[PDB]
Amino acid sequence: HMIELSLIGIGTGNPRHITGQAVDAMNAADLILIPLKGADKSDLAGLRRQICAAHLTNPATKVIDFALPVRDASNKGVDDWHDAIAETWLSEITAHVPGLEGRVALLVWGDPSLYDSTLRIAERLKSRLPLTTKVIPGITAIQALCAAHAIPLNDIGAPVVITTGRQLRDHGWPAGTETVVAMLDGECSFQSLPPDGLTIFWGACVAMPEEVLIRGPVAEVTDEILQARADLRARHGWVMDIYLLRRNV
Amino acid sequence: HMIELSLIGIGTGNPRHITGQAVDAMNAADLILIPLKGADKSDLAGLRRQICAAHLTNPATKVIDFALPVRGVDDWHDAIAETWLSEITAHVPGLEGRVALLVWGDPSLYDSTLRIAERLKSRLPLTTKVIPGITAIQALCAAHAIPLNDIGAPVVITTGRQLRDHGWPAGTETVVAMLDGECSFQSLPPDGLTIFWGACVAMPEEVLIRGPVAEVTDEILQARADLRARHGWVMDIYLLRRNV
Ligand SMILES: Nc1ncnc2c1ncn2[C@@H]1O[C@H](CSCC[C@H](N)C(=O)O)[C@@H](O)[C@H]1O
Ligand SMILES: Nc1ncnc2c1ncn2[C@@H]1O[C@H](CSCC[C@H](N)C(=O)O)[C@@H](O)[C@H]1O
């Protein structure tokens, strides 16, 4: 017996981001596992279900909501948490495909390759299930941002650094590039850089109805971005943002 | 009273890469301009037409094949812009309508279309929109079932020439190289490097190879050369992971 586990990218919140390949993988599944709404409102558990429902035409596919484990904030904590998530998946798969021969899908925001834990958690399962893992690409927040601003990611023939807010705060401007895209940033970390010669293309809730886009010289639009971000957060209870920095010195 | 020009990403060769957003933009178009086959077989001009045919359902949308000018680079890009303008003038002479170009992968990533289209802003009453598509980076990682990044870590996306000119990019343990016609990972000391390589990713001809660079370099060279000999063209992409 063999479980085929598909990690299906579903894009950045625009329900039209889903690809035909993703639709096909949903329709081939015996079981689709989706997390229940929890504390993290940015998971948009309802939107995930909506996207699934808009395209699932296989009448036999089971769609099963499950409670995602909570990380122990009082803790290794991340490690135990990911272990617990794997255990939950393993229990769900075993309960619902007890013959252990079948196709199971998880729906992953954006693309599964990009700052997302699902693939590495799934690796834990390889030694406990007869398992093959497949990945279906989805639209990333990087591409959504560039499309919204109608800008290239790269300068002509030039490298690009993709990084995190914390990496920018710990190390400053990355070596060997004039373009940086920052993800996983909860604190507009570009504000800690020298603004000299930097242009920012910023977006919050990109490709969603709440989308806000701001562009300009970092020295001029930093406070505009801080305010827009805080406003969006106050009114919605959560915010996800991403930005591209272009250096011209 | 505007030409709305959509640059529609169409993915890496798999017709199923097309997003719903791309389908919608195709169906909203009055005109879709697609290049005829040329000397460069890697453009897969026929495949672009087929991917369009698989998704376009509006019977009033007109798919028009045009001769793409050939290449110095500035003049070539100017000539391409002039060709699109001539086609738009010819097929939408009232200059009010929706026009689309179908761009391999995502329009943001190592593709000249977006910057060439900028030339038309001053020539037409123009609004430009971009529809994202699956990139070759994502297709490669998906085919190998691997993460792009190490946990919480930076990633460098670069070209074959930048890799040759500067060596291992500073500040990263992960590099993805695009626009490389010659396996430029050979220009690096192989110690501690692992490669995840793919040619013709997400197409029927797909070849995937992974392993320590020293171990699989020649395997990759031969597989690449074999594809190129049998098909007349090849496109490859790879991710390098350093552990030192
Ligand atoms: N709709 C959206 N708008 C702005 N940023 C977004 C976003 N969705 C995701 N992000 C970015 O992605 C980070 C979550 S990590 C998950 C990334 C996802 N796998 C992808 O392919 O995009 C956020 O901190 C933010 O930087
Ligand atoms: N099917 C495929 N397999 C392997 N590499 C590919 C590919 N399609 C595109 N590429 C890569 O992309 C380069 C062309 S530049 C265009 C990139 C495209 N906009 C994108 O988003 O992917 C090639 O030199 C190669 O590095």
Strands A62-66 and A31-35: parallel
Atom number of ligand 2 nearest to Cα B133: 21
Strand-pair partners of A241: A204
Q: In Å, how far are B12, B35, B36, B49, B161 from B43, measured between CA atoms?
A: 11, 9, 9, 11, 21
A82, A88 in Cβ contact below 8 A? no
The answer to whether A177 faces chain B, any CB pair under 8 Å, is: yes
Residues B111 and B209: their CA atoms lie apart, in Å, by 26
User: Is residue A27 helix, strand or coil?
Assistant: helix
How many residue pairs bridge chain A and chain B with CB atoms within 8 Å of each other?
165
- Distance (Å, rounded) from C-alpha A205 to C-alpha A14? 10
Q: Which residues in chain A are closer than 8 Å to B157, comparing Cβ atoms?
A: 153-154, 159-162
10 Å CB burial of residue B3 (0-12, 13-18, 19+) is: buried
What is the spatial distance between Cα A186 and Cα A226, in angstroms, rounded to a whole number? Answer: 11
Cα of B170 to nearest chain A Cα, Å? 6
**Could you give the C-alpha distances from B16 to A20, A157, B13, in angstroms and in order?**
5, 29, 9
B-facing residues of A in 113-152 (CB < 8 A) are 113-116, 119-120, 133-140, 142-144, 146-148, 150-152
Say how many residues make up chain B. 244
Rg (CA), chain B: 20
Query: Could you tell me where in chain B the CATH 3.30.950.10 domains are found?
Result: 135-244
In whole angstroms, give the CA distance from residue B206 to residue B13: 10
- Would the CB atoms of B20 and A18 count as touching at under 8 Å? yes
Contact residues for B222 (Cβ-Cβ < 8 A; gap 6+): none
Residue B18 three-state SS? coil
Neighbouring C-beta atoms of residue A194, cutoff 10 Å: 11
Name residue A175's amino acid: A
Please give the Cα distance from A38 to A80 (Å, whole number): 18
CATH number of B135-244: 3.30.950.10
Cα distances (angstroms) measured from residue A249 to each of A182, A235, B171: 20, 38, 20
Which stretches within chain A are classed as H helix?
20-28, 45-55, 77-96, 118-125, 141-149, 165-171, 218-236
A2: three-class secondary structure by DSSP: coil
Cite the residue boundaries of each domain of chain A with CATH code 3.30.950.10.
140-249
Cβ proximity of B169 and B158 under 8 Å = yes
User: Which option is the CATH number for A140-249: 3.40.50.720, 3.30.413.10, 3.30.950.10, 1.10.3720.10?
Assistant: 3.30.950.10
Q: How far is A118 from chain B (nearest CA, A)?
A: 10
- Residue A157 CA to ligand 2 center (angstroms) comes to 14
Give the residue range(s) of CATH 3.40.1010.10 domains in chain A. 1-139
The DSSP symbol for B173 reads S
Q: Enter the tokens of residue B176.
A: 């993805």
CATH of domain A1-139: 3.40.1010.10
Cα A10 from chain centroid (whole Å): 9
Alpha carbon distance B1, B98 (integer Å): 11
| SS3 (DSSP) at B3 | strand
Architecture of the domain spanning B1-134: 3-Layer(aba) Sandwich (3.40)
* Nearest-5° Cα angle at A157, A195 to B14: 115
